[PDB]
Design a binder for these strands. Structure first.
Length: 266
RNA sequence: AUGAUCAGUAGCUGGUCCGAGAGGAUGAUCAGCCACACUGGGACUGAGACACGGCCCAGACUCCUACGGGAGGCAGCAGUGGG
RNA sequence: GUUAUCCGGAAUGAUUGGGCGUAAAGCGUCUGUAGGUGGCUUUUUAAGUCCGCCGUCAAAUCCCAGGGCUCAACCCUGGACAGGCGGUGGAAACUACCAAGCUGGAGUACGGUAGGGGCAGAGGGAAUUUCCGGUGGAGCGGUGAAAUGCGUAGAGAUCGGAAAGAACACCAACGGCGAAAGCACUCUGCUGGGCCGACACUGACACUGAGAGACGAAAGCUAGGGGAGCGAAUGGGAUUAGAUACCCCAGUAGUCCUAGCCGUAAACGAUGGAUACUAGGCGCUGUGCGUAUCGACCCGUGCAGUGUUGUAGCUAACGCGUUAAGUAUCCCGCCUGGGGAGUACGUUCGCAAGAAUGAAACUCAAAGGAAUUGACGGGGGCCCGCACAAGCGGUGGAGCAUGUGGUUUAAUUCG
RNA sequence: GAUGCCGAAGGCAGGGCUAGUGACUGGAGUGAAGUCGUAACAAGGUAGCCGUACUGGAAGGUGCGGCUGGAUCA
RNA sequence: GUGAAACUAAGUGGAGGUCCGAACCGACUGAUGUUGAAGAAUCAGCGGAUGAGUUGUGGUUAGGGGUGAAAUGCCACUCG
RNA sequence: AGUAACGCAAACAUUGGUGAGAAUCCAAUGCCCCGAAAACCUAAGGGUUCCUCCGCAAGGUUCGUCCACGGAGGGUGAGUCAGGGCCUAAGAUCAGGCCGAAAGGCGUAGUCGAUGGACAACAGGUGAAUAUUCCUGUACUACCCCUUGUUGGUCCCGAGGGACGGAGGAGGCUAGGUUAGCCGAAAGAUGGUUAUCGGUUCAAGGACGCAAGGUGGGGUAGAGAAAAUGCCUCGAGCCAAUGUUCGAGUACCAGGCGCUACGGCGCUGAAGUAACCGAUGCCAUACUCCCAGGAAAAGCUCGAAAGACCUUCAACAAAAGGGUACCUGUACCCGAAACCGACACAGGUAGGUAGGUAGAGAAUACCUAGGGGCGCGAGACAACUCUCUCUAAGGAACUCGGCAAAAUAGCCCCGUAACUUCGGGAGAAGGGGUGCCCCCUCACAAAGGGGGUCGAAGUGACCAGGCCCGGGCGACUGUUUACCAAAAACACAGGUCUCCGCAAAGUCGUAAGACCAUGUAUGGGGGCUGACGCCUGCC
RNA sequence: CUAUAACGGUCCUAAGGUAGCGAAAUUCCUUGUCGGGUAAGUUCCGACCCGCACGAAAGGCGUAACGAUCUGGGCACUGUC
RNA sequence: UCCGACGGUGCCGAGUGGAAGGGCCGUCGCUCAACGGAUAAAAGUUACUCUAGGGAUAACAGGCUGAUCUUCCCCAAGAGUUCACAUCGACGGGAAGGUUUGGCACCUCGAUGUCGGCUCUUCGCCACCUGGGGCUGUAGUAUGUUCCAAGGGUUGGGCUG
């Protein structure tokens, strides 16, 4: 840790120390996915089970404009770890929005064109100096996708660029997307919240997904490779079904091809 | 902590040896005091020793035996063995 | 006579008697409890201290004077001493206690000054690298030479634009600030210390300080970010007898930020802090004054800071020299041969790497400091010989003479 | 006499501490002055050393920070 | 106790796939059986036991295909 | 071969009745076993196997006047229970439509389907077999219509309320139990005993809404948005186990009086209170804490640009009137021999109630209620086999292996090594006491501290770890070859490499569609490795 | 002084196995050798070591606790003998 | 062999006249070697195994046979101080027995369970001990060798299956 509110670390005593939640909810939920990795005919792509899910919620695109706000209190949501608060616009529109950084006390929070740049709400990139700290960009002028993982959701820019295309995605290198888009302009979601360690699985891993490791475990049928006294013919192409883990490369197009540039591969 | 407790070592002092002195090292002989006297423990007698040459019990040794059972201990003087 | 053993020689633990810039030695720097020390006046106490006296300090040793064994050793009279402790009757300057003050100590307020002091948040300029596009050509990069590498899927160079990180020229100065470490582009916000000046006020409320608490260059470590350049490691090229170095082309951790941790350095002025004194000549910052300051300036008076053929003095010498290792006082830390060691063991601290405290056996008789003479130097300054350079001829090639090694031989004699 | 308290000899379990010893093993001090380098001392010829980190037959090399008990006109 | 912090000594509280042990679940070892009670379990011991635990009911995937902490087991006393 | 077997080792016999005959039928006197069970109730399934009167060749691995056997009759009567009926999850189907050779797949409006949610009573008595349904006493809910009072009502809704989750830690209170009082009976076949045994019950509804550690009102104004934003005047509402009354000056009830085919029915019928201690029960769908922060709809309530309605129809309430509340199952069994396994095979199988004594305990052992003796016996009784007791000296010396046994195994207290990421091992190891009575209080529910005393033994019964040392491997818990191997196998978290800014990669599919994520590179997917510590070289 | 011979020379490769460990569940001959345990022990433990085919995350070297794991020893208790 | 290239030959050539093609004469292409050559073109495992058959085809074992192995014996230079044979005995030879190592693989793969230990034995012999004898470089006490004879008896543990 390097910032305040250090992550609690359960000292030794008995391998690990699970827990038992207990809270309340107030509307703002449909039912969320509750069928486990399936399809109705074939599970497809194994690894995925365990209960403890539900609770979906919404609010992403944000069509509201020049409307003040007031972040009431903070709140956490399953799956994605980066808070979501509950805010409270000047008028009284019940929403959530991705919890920026320095807030909780309400702060400003406001969307629309020509608004105070800091970490309010939606704000068209068309009106942005450099953009050293955005948040969640959108492929189009209406969606709210891309890096929605508030935590670590970073994507610098290139000061002022024409042709209506900039954005500097993290591990995704740099690409070109419409400029007529908007974002929360937060680019924050706490990094220490994910800095913590799982522990030793059991009551922390399975409670979210089935075993992630498979191993050779022999059996030429159960897996493209296997057999032998104990060792495994690794490297000799052993991916589940013609895959190819040694890079190779994918995603091939010609017309609607990738508009990303630079993209270094070391 | 102006240092308890613990561990190693040791009788104390008057004095002795050295040193110009201070100090340092010791305290054999003579004398005062303390402690012990086969080892551990205990009491009795008596003004006083719970007492080398007193008693009782236990232990390790030495010696006697009709082995049933008993007798001793110089860290008093002179001496023996041993070191 | 030898050996053993204590003391002396050892002012080599020094209380009388020593030291810590370089020889062993100030802990890396502050704050601060206990402890040690503490300005000036009067009164008082008089505990310490001092005077006298009364007890005890056994005798015998030791010492002084005097006796007896024919001397002496030895024995012996009296005295001295037993440096101490307690008590009583005094003395009162000093130290200490108590009371009332004073002020030069120290502290505070008022008004100003300088500074990279510190923390946080912004913003500014050059350059480097990278991405895209234009122009254009075959070379570029690099070295003592080269090569690896980048190049005609066309770099470099050049121009336009973008992204990003770090440090921030000049001013910078023998400068300044800070306890130390350390800290410099500009701005704002909060904040510490130092200094001067007419003063106003308290009033010694002080100094130092084991333990303890806090701060710590860089490197390193934990978690999360960032990453232009540089660059441990590592991979190639080159050099070389070899180089798993120096040098060349790349390059990871790291270097940067937040938080926590480790606490070490020629943490060096290698000379701990505080105070009072002792010859002088030049360089900063505040303030007073100087025909009305007519001026760049002139004459003082304080803080901090260099050099000095720096004097006395001090020092082994080098050197220091009122910011002295000069003359003194207060208190704390440290050393008392070299190697082994600042390691081993144990305790404590740490995530780890390790830090702190700290031995002995054995072994040598030497380690070490300054300075002196000379030599040496792929150190410097200046100078002389075919010494080089300028030039001619020659050797090493050839046949032959001769000398020497090696070989051979009974010897192929010796130097 | 019996009984009870205290109680030495002696007995049991588990620790601390100390001396001796121990396959094997680390570092260190010496002796022929052997083998491979020559790292330091004159800028010893990439100045040296201190702390720290990594690497290497070895002396040692390299990075960062710092000092000079560094030569030189820089 | 420190200027304020970490610290420490009680109490409170309460976590831990924790410890012991029934129901339950899962089953290592020995014996009795193995034309047996039973086409394989019982008896005397053992492991787990608020847990990635277990169970009742219903549904979704099913063979060259599904599922699988994959034994290539299982897919209803059969099966790579 | 007529050998074995006649199916857990919870033994059985006797006096009578009936019959041709009965050890196993029935009746009576007992033994014995179980006692959170081989009791009862209920779901699934089964499904008439329940009851009664008869018969029995076959089915009951003995007979049988016995039977869940056969052959004839009789018997499941609730608007409140349950299933239909409203609503809804996984999921199925699914107009038009999107797709696919045909077939068909997928999928929405909409429409089905639960172990989910939503209105309403019990206590007695009666019958050979049923009963919260028959009967008696006392109550409740919803709809329609009517009467009275008041008031504006009003869709496939908006909003509120419904939707419940973990674990852990306090108190009260209830089932129920014990003691005492009271009532009734017996006061007694070896001594003593005027005191022994039994009962002491009692539901909903309604009122009460219970000294309470559960959970800020009200009024006015606002064309965009509004889980809403500003003032004023006073501050004291919901939810809720239990108890106390009415309900029961009743019924029930020990025990009698009569009858009796003797199984059982009529009549009558006293006491019916208090104190102490409860639980994994209830208020706690709570609260505290914590985090892997964990269904939907309807019923209900309220509001609806007061659109449609508009002296109306309706809404609320009152008589807590009157009428109505249609259709089915509901017998028996149900960790049981009528269920699932070919049988009456000790195998397997969800939920609920569940007492006394000792004990922490639904442990264990012995007793209640209640349910059984498991359906071949009697003698003999040697070898041998199966399940066990007790066993001189020594002691594993057996053996592939101390397998199998034995033993250890209670609580409190004292004490406890190497090592440690120092959480542990430490329930190490190794010891002592705890019985009973009396006294201190002639009880402060226990416990402790003294004294005295009994037996060989005092957790003395059941129940109830064996410990220590060194070493290989896997960190561990967990999972796995369901019916011989469950292990250093597998799994696990940690680390790293690689692919994807996406209608994803990738997986299912000829397609559509869809899973993967309504997430998103501290995401996710695939491979190897795989706790941590020191490290992970050259090519 | 034998061995050792760290040194050197030479041939062959992409580079030629570093640290640690090693007769270890992976060295046939090794029933190995030395030392400890036993009256005796090809079993086990501690080392040396000439590891025939140990070896760095298809992991190497350690490692508290944990496991109905595998191997060996001792005490109490056992006719298991 | 078949598939094909090309020349010659008016042989034929599906309406006719030609042609393509075919036929005939002549030649060429195939480590087609596993070469009387199955394809133009095709390597392994199966301790998961399954099925059809046989011992005419193996493994344990019986049997035939049996060089090797075991035992005994002949000639005999020498060792044993001397001396060949108390004992032993080189260079070679002849047999018995039969449990070793093999061949055979004759009878059994519509099957006869491998080793070892434990329990309980049976027989023979060139029996180690007890008994009766010869020689002895056997003094005695004890041994060496040989002959008859087994009547009987003939061990407990550490380690390893």
């Amino acid at each position: 840790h390097l910032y305040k509110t250090s992550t609690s670390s359960t000292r030794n005593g008995a391998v690990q120390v699970k827990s038992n939640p207990r809270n309340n909810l107030i509307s703002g939920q449909r039912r969320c996915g509750k069928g486990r990795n399936a399809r109705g005919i074939i599970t497809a792509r194994h690894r995925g089970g365990g209960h403890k899910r539900l609770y979906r919620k919404i609010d992403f695109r944000r069509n509201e404009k020049d409307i003040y706000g007031k972040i009431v209190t903070i709140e956490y949501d399953p799956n994605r770890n980066a808070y979501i608060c509950l805010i409270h616009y000047g008028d009284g529109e019940k929403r959530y929005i991705l919890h920026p950084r320095g807030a909780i006390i309400g702060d400003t929070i406001v969307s629309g064109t020509e608004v105070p740049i800091k970490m309010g709400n939606a704000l068209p990139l068309t009106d942005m100096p450099l953009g050293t700290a955005i948040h969640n960009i959108e492929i189009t002028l209406g969606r709210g996708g891309q890096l929605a993982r508030a935590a670590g959701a970073v994507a610098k820019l290139i000061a002022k660029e024409g042709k209506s295309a900039t954005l500097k995605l993290p591990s995704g290198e740099v690409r070109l997307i419409s400029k007529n888009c908007s974002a929360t302009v937060g680019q924050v979601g706490n990094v220490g919240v994910n800095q913590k360690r799982l522990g030793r699985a059991g009551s922390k891993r399975w409670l979210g997904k089935r075993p992630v490791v498979r191993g050779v475990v022999m059996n030429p049928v159960d897996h493209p490779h296997g057999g032998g006294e104990g060792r495994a013919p690794i490297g000799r192409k052993s991916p589940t079904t013609p895959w190819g883990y040694p890079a190779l490369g994918r995603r091939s197009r010609k017309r609607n091809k990738y508009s990303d540039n630079f993209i270094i591969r070391r």
